[PDB]
Write a protein that binds this ligand. Structure first.
Ligand SMILES: [Zn+2]
Lengths: 117, 9
């Protein structure tokens, strides 16, 4: 019956909160990177769960700790950390395998067209 | 995006 805080004991740490996009998404992320920003939107990087390291470009994902720097002119937060490592737990929580497949099969992210003309 | 890594190469 070995469970432990992992799945038994109450608040392990004591009170601290293990981050969360909904709260620390747009504003938060945008604060980590700064002014700079590629074709995509920082808010997007926040959606996937990418927290910069106090400097623009280089950012590590939560749980999957994927360190990505020097993104591509045509890409997206999810597409990057996902494809690179299709096993980001934090991702499964964001939009589950549903989105995971969205990328590893077709083009994910990038909207504004609704129906893509 | 390129893989950070760095470490020692
Ligand atoms: Zn990740």
């Amino acid at each position: 019956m070995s469970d432990a805080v992992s799945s038994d004991r109450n608040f392990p740490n004591s009170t601290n909160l293990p981050r969360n996009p909904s709260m620390a998404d747009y504003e938060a992320r945008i604060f980590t990177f700064g002014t700079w920003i590629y074709s995509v939107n920082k808010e997007q990087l926040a959606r996937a769960g990418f927290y910069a390291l106090g400097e623009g470009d280089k950012v590590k994902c939560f749980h999957c700790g994927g360190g990505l720097t020097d993104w591509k002119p045509s890409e997206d937060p999810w597409e990057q950390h996902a494809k690179w490592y299709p096993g980001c737990k934090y991702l499964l929580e964001q939009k589950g395998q549903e989105y995971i497949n969205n990328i590893h099969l077709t083009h994910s992210l990038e909207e504004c067209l609704v129906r893509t003309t | 995006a390129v893989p950070i890594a760095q470490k020692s190469e």
